[PDB]
Amino acid sequence: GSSGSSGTGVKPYGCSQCAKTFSLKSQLIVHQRSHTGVKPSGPSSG
């Protein structure tokens, strides 16, 4: 089996793009700078 839904608790600093949260703002402020910029392979003649 797998444990879960055991007691509520939602950190104040959480990311929307993903389901990853953090306790320290510094961690988020920096993390947020991950869902932007570098893009995955796309155009061949680009």
Ligand SMILES: [Zn+2]
């Ligand atoms: Zn994120």
